[PDB]
Design a protein around this ligand. Sequence first.
Ligand SMILES: NC(=O)c1ccc[n+]([C@@H]2O[C@H](COP(=O)([O-])OP(=O)(O)OC[C@H]3O[C@@H](n4cnc5c(N)ncnc54)[C@H](OP(=O)(O)O)[C@@H]3O)[C@@H](O)[C@H]2O)c1
Ligand SMILES: NC(=O)c1ccc[n+]([C@@H]2O[C@H](COP(=O)([O-])OP(=O)(O)OC[C@H]3O[C@@H](n4cnc5c(N)ncnc54)[C@H](OP(=O)(O)O)[C@@H]3O)[C@@H](O)[C@H]2O)c1
Ligand SMILES: NC(=O)c1ccc[n+]([C@@H]2O[C@H](COP(=O)([O-])OP(=O)(O)OC[C@H]3O[C@@H](n4cnc5c(N)ncnc54)[C@H](OP(=O)(O)O)[C@@H]3O)[C@@H](O)[C@H]2O)c1
Ligand SMILES: NC(=O)c1ccc[n+]([C@@H]2O[C@H](COP(=O)([O-])OP(=O)(O)OC[C@H]3O[C@@H](n4cnc5c(N)ncnc54)[C@H](OP(=O)(O)O)[C@@H]3O)[C@@H](O)[C@H]2O)c1
Ligand SMILES: COc1ccc2c(c1)c(CC(=O)O)c(C)n2C(=O)c1ccc(Cl)cc1
Ligand SMILES: COc1ccc2c(c1)c(CC(=O)O)c(C)n2C(=O)c1ccc(Cl)cc1
Ligand SMILES: COc1ccc2c(c1)c(CC(=O)O)c(C)n2C(=O)c1ccc(Cl)cc1
Ligand SMILES: COc1ccc2c(c1)c(CC(=O)O)c(C)n2C(=O)c1ccc(Cl)cc1
Ligand SMILES: [Cl-]
Ligand SMILES: [Cl-]
Ligand SMILES: [Cl-]
Ligand SMILES: [Cl-]
Ligand SMILES: [Cl-]
Ligand SMILES: [Cl-]
Ligand SMILES: [Cl-]
Ligand SMILES: [Cl-]
Ligand SMILES: [Cl-]
Ligand SMILES: [Cl-]
Ligand SMILES: [Cl-]
Ligand SMILES: [Cl-]
Ligand SMILES: [Cl-]
Ligand SMILES: [Cl-]
Ligand SMILES: [Cl-]
Ligand SMILES: [Cl-]
Ligand SMILES: [Cl-]
Ligand SMILES: [Cl-]
Ligand SMILES: [Cl-]
Ligand SMILES: [Cl-]
Lengths: 330, 328, 323, 331
Amino acid sequence: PGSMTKTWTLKKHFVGYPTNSDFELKTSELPPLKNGEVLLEALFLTVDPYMRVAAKRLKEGDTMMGQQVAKVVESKNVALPKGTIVLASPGWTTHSISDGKDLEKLLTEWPDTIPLSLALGTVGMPGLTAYFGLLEICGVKGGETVMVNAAAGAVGSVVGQIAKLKGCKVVGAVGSDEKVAYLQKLGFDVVFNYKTVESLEETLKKASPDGYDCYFDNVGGEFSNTVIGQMKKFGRIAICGAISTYNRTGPLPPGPPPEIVIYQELRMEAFVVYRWQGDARQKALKDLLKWVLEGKIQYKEYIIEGFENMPAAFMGMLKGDNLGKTIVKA
Amino acid sequence: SMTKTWTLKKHFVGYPTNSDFELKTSELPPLKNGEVLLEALFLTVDPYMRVAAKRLKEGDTMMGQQVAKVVESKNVALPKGTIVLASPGWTTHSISDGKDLEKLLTEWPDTIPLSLALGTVGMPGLTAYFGLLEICGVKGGETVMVNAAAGAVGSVVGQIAKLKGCKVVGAVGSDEKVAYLQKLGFDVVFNYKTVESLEETLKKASPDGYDCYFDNVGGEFSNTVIGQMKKFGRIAICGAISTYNRTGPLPPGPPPEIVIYQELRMEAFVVYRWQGDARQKALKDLLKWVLEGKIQYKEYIIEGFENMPAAFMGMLKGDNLGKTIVKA
Amino acid sequence: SMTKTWTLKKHFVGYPTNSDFELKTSELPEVLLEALFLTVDPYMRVAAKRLKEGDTMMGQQVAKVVESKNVALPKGTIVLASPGWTTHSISDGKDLEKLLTEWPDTIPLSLALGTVGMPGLTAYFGLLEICGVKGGETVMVNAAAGAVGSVVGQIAKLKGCKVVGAVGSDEKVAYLQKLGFDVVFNYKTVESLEETLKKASPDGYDCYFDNVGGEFSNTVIGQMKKFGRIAICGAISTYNRTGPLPPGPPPEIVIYQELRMEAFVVYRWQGDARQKALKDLLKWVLEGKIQYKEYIIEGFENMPAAFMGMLKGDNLGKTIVKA
Amino acid sequence: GPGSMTKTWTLKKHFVGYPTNSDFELKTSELPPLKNGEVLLEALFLTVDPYMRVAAKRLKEGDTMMGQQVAKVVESKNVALPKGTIVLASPGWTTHSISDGKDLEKLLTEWPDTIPLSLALGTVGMPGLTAYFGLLEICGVKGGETVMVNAAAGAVGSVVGQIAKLKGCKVVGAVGSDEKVAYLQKLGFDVVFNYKTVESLEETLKKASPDGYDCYFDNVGGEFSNTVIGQMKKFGRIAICGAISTYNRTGPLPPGPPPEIVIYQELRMEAFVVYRWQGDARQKALKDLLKWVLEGKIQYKEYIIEGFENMPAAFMGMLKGDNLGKTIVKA
Ligand SMILES: NC(=O)c1ccc[n+]([C@@H]2O[C@H](COP(=O)([O-])OP(=O)(O)OC[C@H]3O[C@@H](n4cnc5c(N)ncnc54)[C@H](OP(=O)(O)O)[C@@H]3O)[C@@H](O)[C@H]2O)c1
Ligand SMILES: NC(=O)c1ccc[n+]([C@@H]2O[C@H](COP(=O)([O-])OP(=O)(O)OC[C@H]3O[C@@H](n4cnc5c(N)ncnc54)[C@H](OP(=O)(O)O)[C@@H]3O)[C@@H](O)[C@H]2O)c1
Ligand SMILES: NC(=O)c1ccc[n+]([C@@H]2O[C@H](COP(=O)([O-])OP(=O)(O)OC[C@H]3O[C@@H](n4cnc5c(N)ncnc54)[C@H](OP(=O)(O)O)[C@@H]3O)[C@@H](O)[C@H]2O)c1
Ligand SMILES: NC(=O)c1ccc[n+]([C@@H]2O[C@H](COP(=O)([O-])OP(=O)(O)OC[C@H]3O[C@@H](n4cnc5c(N)ncnc54)[C@H](OP(=O)(O)O)[C@@H]3O)[C@@H](O)[C@H]2O)c1
Ligand SMILES: COc1ccc2c(c1)c(CC(=O)O)c(C)n2C(=O)c1ccc(Cl)cc1
Ligand SMILES: COc1ccc2c(c1)c(CC(=O)O)c(C)n2C(=O)c1ccc(Cl)cc1
Ligand SMILES: COc1ccc2c(c1)c(CC(=O)O)c(C)n2C(=O)c1ccc(Cl)cc1
Ligand SMILES: COc1ccc2c(c1)c(CC(=O)O)c(C)n2C(=O)c1ccc(Cl)cc1
Ligand SMILES: [Cl-]
Ligand SMILES: [Cl-]
Ligand SMILES: [Cl-]
Ligand SMILES: [Cl-]
Ligand SMILES: [Cl-]
Ligand SMILES: [Cl-]
Ligand SMILES: [Cl-]
Ligand SMILES: [Cl-]
Ligand SMILES: [Cl-]
Ligand SMILES: [Cl-]
Ligand SMILES: [Cl-]
Ligand SMILES: [Cl-]
Ligand SMILES: [Cl-]
Ligand SMILES: [Cl-]
Ligand SMILES: [Cl-]
Ligand SMILES: [Cl-]
Ligand SMILES: [Cl-]
Ligand SMILES: [Cl-]
Ligand SMILES: [Cl-]
Ligand SMILES: [Cl-]
């Protein structure tokens, strides 16, 4: 019955970092609800680095992709009554219609003490990425020394804290002194500003002269070439992301020295978080929520108010503004 | 006095965005002796501002020139109502002691907008003038390659080349720009973003090669043009706009084997090198050619000082057809 | 005792040249071993960087005992030793390795340096443990006519796998086609490597036994199946590099395809697993399932030329220097 | 009447990176008898030069390697070229050749007996002419400038520095070994450093001349030149002589120089080939070079390798920095 929505679309494909002129806000009228459908109003929307890469497959005019926490504000579906909170991925839009087959309810034990926006962060997709990347790909068992970059981001910050609660030494790389201070307060063994250190090689050597057992890699590029030169024999690399290339203008940087990869017999595996489904996934979500409640994973969010500022939140996150999960409060 | 000032909130990373600029308002001090209050009429945004901004401190005013009017005068040499060129930056009002100003040509007619003092009959036009006539040294009959050919500098380069008897091959970023320059009479114009092979397109435009390369773009584009320069060909290194917003390293240089065998001469320049009589002669020549119709002028005017960042960013993204001007 | 020794006069810059090597003679003062067959291997190009100028080049050899002060290593015994590029050496016996007890007279002793030696074990563990082939997979192997690659392809065939092989000459294409590899092509002459791999297997590749690295591997990665495994054995296209390494593969492809890539050194496997692999390799050669070809060069004084010829792709099979 | 034997180095395989021995092949052939107007030339000294690495790419496998030589007429049916005449000829890497005389060049009439004939391939030959015109016409030095020259201990660079010194210029030279540093310091170069061992190329150039560089005689290119460009004065001149850092490169070319520096500093950069200058201008420069050598203002040093059979090794060593001065092969 006459609903209106706003939608952020891709006006121009990104060249380097996105700029404001690459996005366009549009207003449309959604149709009335059919049988079994619901009207969803966004409460929190997420912006994520993968959107920079996936945008290349969109056509100009398409809606930007993304997930959101929404509530049902109108319902013709008995399973999804008015007021129900759900996870949905209609893209950058304030209102959408769903038949119920593309939604995901929150954990039944979701308490009132934690913001709903953590369903998009530590107790959501980024937290699951840290969980499986560190515990399954690296396979940490306790006592390892873990190198994690973008350590103050949504994924990296959870990687470090899970590593700490599992008995690991953590060396974290971040892009500002404010982020260094925050992670030092959390208790990370060594944290440094990769933008200001005189030599990345010497900083990593001093942080762990014996080398690194695991490398949770979010950045790639020249940074990873240096870390690879300090991996222990049989060292494991979880190839989570390569954000240093997402906004690159020229050709990719050189690859890591193969003589080091082979002599050290490194194991390097990339992964997508959606690989894990069913029981393993549900167990990981329950563990993440439990650790947040127990205080072993502290929660910090970088909230930006206003749907109209979503392009600016996406661009700021890519440029390192965010401390914790970047969230847009509708 | 009340004034608006655009400042650099954050150093650019890639293309500028709105969050990189901040509008500030200030109260200028009273006019002292020999000082005047200038209120902006037209402001210019230029690609060099993207590169020069790196030496500003966060909070500083963006640099730039403007055509301004005297609205208050305590200096007899600059009476109220005088039109001048000044470079206080992105600001609506400023105070000057008079020693850093430049009057317009004494014979400036009312039939041409004052904003061309920032364009074809100003700094961009002088850039095209000296780069083509003194660096390339065109005398008539040469084949000239010019990129960003629909911009402030490139469009003047092509038309001066045409009136000097040169063949002009121009590269632009949209089909609209292809049509405009073809209407002006450029011999060959193409859209570098859509052509299947830049190497093949340039080869057909001139199988004999290029005597001069007026380079506004740089990067991989120039590597290809260099591969088709005639022996002893001259390159005027005016700009390298394809690198101004780069995040990573510069692209490879041209193959030295071609540069050496072809014995190319490549000279960069800043327009302010030319002063005094040579410069004044060039300004008079540009004005004369505009009046005679040999240089048609097109402007990309954006109204509102508050849209000045948006004009800067639109220019960097190729929105402008002609000189980008902000009407105060 | 007196011996011949090839030493490193100058660190390599690009491909080695003769001026980078120097033939020396020394006076030796346990057992005395005289070399019968010596190996040259690509790893020597990289490992030479940690040698000091004047040091002996590293390497393995099949040798003969010509004098004995240890009854456990009596005169006439055939052994494997790694004194480097030298015709004679002194050893206390604790760093030696006898050949398989069931070594037949029908196979040359030089295969202890090849298919039934370190290169064969490299193919064995790289394909069966790292790739984990179980039968039915499509395996991409480059340098398929080399000591390691040729064994990789033949082990894959006897396990029921499709094999796509890359080589540097038409002669190597013909030999591997005779062996029965499903597809073999000359990577130096094909018009488009991407299309050659695409046509050779439009469905993609389950495993990649990588000996070459560089831009070649970037293209293969773009055609790996999801969860595909890569055995990072070698990167010979970079060993003689003068400038910087080429770009890596596009990370969006590596991540989306969730590839598992593990490098290995063959010496990781010891004890029972290694001895089992040696017995399997010897058995497979005798049954005819692994045919052996060797590129033998006569003369210890031509050992540098064998090393350099191997790096340039002259050799078909394991490069061996007969003393 | 009779027929002579000759040896010839050919290109067996195109170079990949630096050349290796297997890329060359020595062949022996029988030259035909001399016809009227022809001479038989025996090589005395042959030159190897960096350009051969690049030009070899257009040869077909089997072709003779290109190059110049000082040769002597050992048999003549040509009255203008009697027995014993010394000439420059470019038959390639070969010990003997037949010429009709139309592609030869006699030595200077005033060539003295006190200087080796091989200098006709070096300081008083093509490399010296390269330094001469690159520094005096392309850079246009007039006296008082500060000149940056790399490969400063090579055939061209060493002459560039010494001409710069006799014209009243400060010279900063870059070389690849400590032995080359010592030699050029003895010659009197103001500053000489080993670019392979210095901690920071940028800081070394800054200290060598805090005011910047008026001219850059560029033999190297690549990343080295990117750093030199960052310290050129306004209106600085660059003579693009060579780019040897790319000749044996395996991967893609290195990044270009920062355009913002090239433009802001209004640099003038011109490439040249030495053969542009012919006739009277060339003869005058040769006379100046010979005069300066005799007066001692240009000292000559040669890196001689004896044996035609070692010509590939001399070419490869020169590319790798073995040579101090002009690389020469004494037949
Ligand atoms: N399934 C998967 O494999 C999966 C899932 C989710 C995310 N990821 C990846 O994991 C990474 C983190 O994602 P997230 O959601 O946690 O984002 P995030 O870390 O919250 O934000 C991105 C951060 O990356 C850093 N960054 C940006 N450009 C950089 C550069 N050139 N070099 C170094 N650091 C740079 C910035 O922090 P600094 O100030 O520290 O630079 C920025 O804050 C991304 O690569 C993303 O694609 C992978
Ligand atoms: N040396 C001097 O004294 C001096 C003085 C003034 C200007 N300049 C230089 O001259 C050039 C033009 O200046 P202008 O004032 O006339 O600006 P303009 O051409 O009016 O505007 C810049 C134009 O460059 C083009 N462009 C942007 N990114 C590009 C890319 N990656 N590749 C190719 N073209 C691209 C766009 O047109 P398309 O649609 O063609 O992409 C855009 O319209 C700049 O390099 C500037 O720095 C030098
Ligand atoms: N422990 C280990 O992990 C281990 C042990 C042994 C060997 N390896 C590695 O496995 C590889 C094979 O060594 P090998 O002992 O079997 O000897 P090999 O295959 O005979 O190695 C030389 C061969 O490599 C090829 N090659 C050389 N340059 C190349 C290039 N740029 N691109 C492609 N192919 C090139 C040539 O054959 P084509 O021209 O036909 O390609 C040449 O015949 C090497 O990378 C070596 O380091 C690893
Ligand atoms: N345009 C012309 O007409 C013309 C004519 C002749 C020569 N040239 C050029 O001038 C240059 C010198 O030629 P030349 O006959 O005098 O040879 P040269 O300097 O006598 O010998 C070459 C020298 O270059 C140096 N070198 C090699 N690779 C290098 C690298 N990657 N980086 C830095 N230096 C490197 C080595 O000295 P270090 O140990 O100091 O590195 C080596 O000794 C070459 O670029 C050549 O192509 C041009
Ligand atoms: C790609 O850069 C290298 C460098 C050194 C290498 C290898 C590869 C390989 C593998 C190969 O590539 O063949 C080996 C075996 N390396 C050794 O030096 C070595 C020697 C003795 C022992 Cl016990 C273990 C290792
Ligand atoms: C940087 O790539 C090259 C390629 C070929 C070159 C040169 C440089 C130079 C300059 C140099 O670098 O020495 C020369 C002289 N080339 C010739 O092959 C040649 C030979 C004979 C004549 Cl008459 C003219 C040119
Ligand atoms: C590095 O280039 C990419 C490109 C696209 C990507 C990712 C990474 C990642 C991983 C990451 O980097 O976050 C994800 C998740 N991509 C998706 O577009 C996507 C979206 C929804 C689903 Cl259900 C599955 C995949
Ligand atoms: C490509 O990197 C740069 C960097 C700075 C530049 C320029 C180009 C150009 C040339 C151009 O690109 O337009 C100019 C004019 N720059 C200035 O900052 C400047 C400002 C005022 C004066 Cl008086 C003199 C110079
Ligand atoms: Cl599109
Ligand atoms: Cl570093
Ligand atoms: Cl270790
Ligand atoms: Cl906090
Ligand atoms: Cl900036
Ligand atoms: Cl600052
Ligand atoms: Cl093209
Ligand atoms: Cl020409
Ligand atoms: Cl005029
Ligand atoms: Cl070495
Ligand atoms: Cl050493
Ligand atoms: Cl291809
Ligand atoms: Cl697949
Ligand atoms: Cl997926
Ligand atoms: Cl003689
Ligand atoms: Cl050929
Ligand atoms: Cl440096
Ligand atoms: Cl200066
Ligand atoms: Cl190159
Ligand atoms: Cl001396």
